[PDB]
Amino acid sequence: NNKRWYFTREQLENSPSRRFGVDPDKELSYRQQAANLLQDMGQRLNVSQLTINTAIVYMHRFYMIQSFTRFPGNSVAPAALFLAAKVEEQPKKLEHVIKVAHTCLHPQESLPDTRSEAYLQQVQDLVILESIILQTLGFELTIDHPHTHVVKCTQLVRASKDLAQTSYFMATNSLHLTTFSLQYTPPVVACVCIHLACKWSNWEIPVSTDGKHWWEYVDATVTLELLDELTHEFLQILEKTPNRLKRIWNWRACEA
Amino acid sequence: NNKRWYFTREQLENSPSRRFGVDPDKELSYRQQAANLLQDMGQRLNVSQLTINTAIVYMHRFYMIQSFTRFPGNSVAPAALFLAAKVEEQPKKLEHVIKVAHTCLHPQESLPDTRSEAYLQQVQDLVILESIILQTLGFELTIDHPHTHVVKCTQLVRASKDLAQTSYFMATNSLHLTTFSLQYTPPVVACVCIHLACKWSNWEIPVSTDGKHWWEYVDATVTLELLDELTHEFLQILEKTPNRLKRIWNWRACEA
Amino acid sequence: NNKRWYFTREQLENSPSRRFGVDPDKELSYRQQAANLLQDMGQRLNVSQLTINTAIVYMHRFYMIQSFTRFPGNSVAPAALFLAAKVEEQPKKLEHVIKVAHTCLHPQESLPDTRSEAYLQQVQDLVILESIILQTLGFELTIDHPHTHVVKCTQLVRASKDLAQTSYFMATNSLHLTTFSLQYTPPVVACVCIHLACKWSNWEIPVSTDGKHWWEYVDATVTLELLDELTHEFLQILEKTPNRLKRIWNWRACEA
Amino acid sequence: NNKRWYFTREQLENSPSRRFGVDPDKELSYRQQAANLLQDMGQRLNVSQLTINTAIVYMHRFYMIQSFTRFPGNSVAPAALFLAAKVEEQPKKLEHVIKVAHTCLHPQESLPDTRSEAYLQQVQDLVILESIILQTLGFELTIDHPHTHVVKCTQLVRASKDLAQTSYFMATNSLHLTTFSLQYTPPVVACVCIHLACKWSNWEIPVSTDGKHWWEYVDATVTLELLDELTHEFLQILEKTPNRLKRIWNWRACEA
């Protein structure tokens, strides 16, 4: 999906920011961070999770071709979130996602204005950034974040209120932490996010009718061994990110 | 210089503009006409002659996937007059790019307003459609011209100025009037606009002592049969344009 | 099918064979002549009429990347007369494909021997070139013809038989003689071999009650200007062959 | 090289062999095994080790667009063992290339015959299937190796001979056994065949007096986390290979 956005490490560390003067150590902090206002400055205009992830790849992949060394990242979200929030059924205005920005961005600075010198180059650059983004993202409109199946595997397999309830949450975090966006397809990235529930509670969901593994539904190539490796990797960003890690450090304190 | 902008019939014979219900002559009118809101529009902006020619090139291509009924050149022209502008190191303001359209399209309706929805509405559109064209040409800014060669070709051979004018002046017709931009190459178009005046003035340029001809310098592929072969279409393409033709005919009234 | 077969007029007159030093008419002389080692050869093998036509399509195509100077048609034909065969659900023996060449090429030397040093040597060559062409053509077996339309088209409009013959025969000149295969599409070439015979017999097809013409049904893009242009070009291209023309003129000496 | 050749992991799970009916380990068994019919097979053709190394590369890529079920390595090796040959200045005869297969594959069946249908038949195949791959590989004969770096890298630091051997020798397993050819780059493969002996031999090569490491010279993209990632991966990849692992391991037993 579509196998153009998924390349080996050849283009992982080859990213514009991974060679245009930004140490790899300074990328999963740049992404996340700017991906933290997405889930907040976005999580405001009743933005569905739908609208939050679309813009979570509308930055990851956008900066995939672009750079931070010449683009307002924190103020690029309006760009990723202009097409994102607009693409999804509930689009918005030129200010709605740019006024609260001043909230989330400038939590102290004075009020903004439509007449003020501000709101001009904001509705200049940002308004034009929309031009500057789609064309790198080939004008596409197809993005199925690894969820739809995770939200589809629950029932038919008959999960519970603590495993399937734990399912929603692993996909998202893989959108605000790991680079599985432009490396692993949404399905394969689902068996892992579903895996971190039973790889937690040890709820090894029994085989299928004919001794078939549950990770064969979200994809036909999802293998245990590889899948094992893909969740462990998730134990890489969580292991050190001292911000959200503590969230899941205790967020599992209220299902049972 | 690029293959994706050379097409069989493909002519425009079965363009997307065909598919809806628009006469071949109409889209043929649409194009040439569309240049009038671009040639006579950029004439207001005091832009470089070459600055506009590149613009017509975009419109001709832009509608090679779209349609004139849905996306009217009426507004499309200033859109293409932005990508070309910047590229030729002297662009203009999106508001003046639009502040030429009003006086050009509606030269009687009151002046437009910077703080009206009727301006702000199309405000993002000229930077949204600017993308719709920005990508439609596969971000292919690089475009060769039948003018530069005409210079050297008539300068290397010691052609006169009054005739030289006929060389350049004819170049301006391949784009606006005809669609030679999408049918032939710049080193093969300049050889048409030269073998057309050669008759008009009743000339014959004494050539090479090497054994080659002068239509071989701009291009060693160019032919003579085709030179006349195209001259017939070329002339004919203005031979049925009773608007732009005569004005060309009158341009040669105070010539001799 | 798509493109890369439908070369431009620019992309034909300056073929890779051009680059060495071969006249457009000469390579055009080579072609048709090379085509003679394909229809008047396959006429020996009792192969399907369309089975050979496709080969000239292969021969015509093969030289769109190669040369007549390197690979002389003399030997390429049995190669292209092999790809066509198999493709047509009916191949031929590698010895019989080659035991057709001698009697055509060398009609004077005593019979060849399968166990002679003169035979084993060139043995791989018909199995070497067959790959050079098999793979250059992207294993594109699927190729349509301007006959199948020619058939129905003259039945669907109720054209006569004698004229219909005049239709079919004309395909063998559009392909063998001209290079319309690489300039237009089968539904748009057959209308040239039909709008050329249509006159010869002195006909006029009563048409549509909507206001459209009969060249618009088989193809809604086709034109008359273009139709006559190509019937004219076609005819004109035969005004430069007083060799096969007369033979063409004599072919209806019994049918006049 | 050069692009479109390195696949992802899940993409390396979802091989063509999956869709037909081959176990993930099974297709993996085919490959490595097929490499045994390239090394100890070409050793009969006496060809250069690097002449064979290129051969495995073609097989490894070939089946990411073909299949192991249809096209058996039994003949696929001599077919790919021909493209490598010629590409190296010293190829071998089409008759011997296959008359090396028999003596390797069937060391009991009677000697082959030059004038046998069993010889003439697979004669055309080795020039037909050679074409299927000539086209399959996007005519990319050019393929780089994880050796070239290993040499210089061990020269630039002045490494010893015993250690170097461990470097070079290890490259030859990176190809045959694993699929690093479609997963990694030569400047990232040579760094794997070095980071394995570094442990095996008990080494660590002090480098550059800038503060930088040596895995930045062979490749400025390479990582240490990744270095173990593959070095760990590798080790496992031979653990499942109880054949070539020991055979590699025993080389350091007869190595004194």
Curated annotation (Swiss-Prot), chains A, B, C, D:
Question: Which coarse location class applies to the principal site listed for this UniProt protein?
Answer: nucleus
* Tissue expression as described in the entry: Ubiquitously expressed.
Q: Does the keyword Transmembrane helix apply?
A: no
Q: Where found, per UniProt?
A: Nucleus
Superkingdom of the source species: Eukaryota
Disulfide pairs here are: none
Record note on what altering residue 254 to Y does = Loss of HIV-1 Tat transactivation
Q: What does the entry's domain section say? A: The histidine-rich domain (HRD) region is intrinsically disordered and promotes the formation of phase-separated liquid droplets that enhance binding of the P-TEFb complex to the CTD (C-terminal domain) of the large subunit of RNA polymerase II (RNA Pol II).
Gene name?
CCNT1
Q: How is it modified after translation?
A: ADP-ribosylation on serine residues by PARP1 in response to DNA damage disrupts the phase separation activity of CCNT1, thereby preventing activation of CDK9.
Q: What are the record keywords, sorted?
A: Acetylation, ADP-ribosylation, Cell cycle, Cell division, Coiled coil, Cyclin, Host-virus interaction, Isopeptide bond, Nucleus, Phosphoprotein, Transcription, Transcription regulation, Ubl conjugation
Q: Does the keyword Cell membrane apply?
A: no
Functional description taken from the UniProt entry: Regulatory subunit of the cyclin-dependent kinase pair (CDK9/cyclin-T1) complex, also called positive transcription elongation factor B (P-TEFb), which facilitates the transition from abortive to productive elongation by phosphorylating the CTD (C-terminal domain) of the large subunit of RNA polymerase II (RNA Pol II). Required to activate the protein kinase activity of CDK9: acts by mediating formation of liquid-liquid phase separation (LLPS) that enhances binding of P-TEFb to the CTD of RNA Pol II. (Microbial infection) In case of HIV or SIV infections, binds to the transactivation domain of the viral nuclear transcriptional activator, Tat, thereby increasing Tat's affinity for the transactivating response RNA element (TAR RNA). Serves as an essential cofactor for Tat, by promoting RNA Pol II activation, allowing transcription of viral genes.
Which Gene Ontology cellular component terms are annotated? cyclin/CDK positive transcription elongation factor complex; cytosol; nucleoplasm; nucleus; P-TEFb complex
Q: Name one GO biological process term.
A: positive regulation of transcription elongation by RNA polymerase II
- Motif Nuclear localization signal, and interaction with Tat-TAR RNA: where? 246-256
Q: Any idea what this protein is called?
A: Cyclin-T1
Q: What protein family is recorded?
A: Belongs to the cyclin family. Cyclin C subfamily.
Q: Name one GO molecular function term.
A: 7SK snRNA binding
> Which residues are annotated as modified residue Phosphoserine in the UniProt record?
110
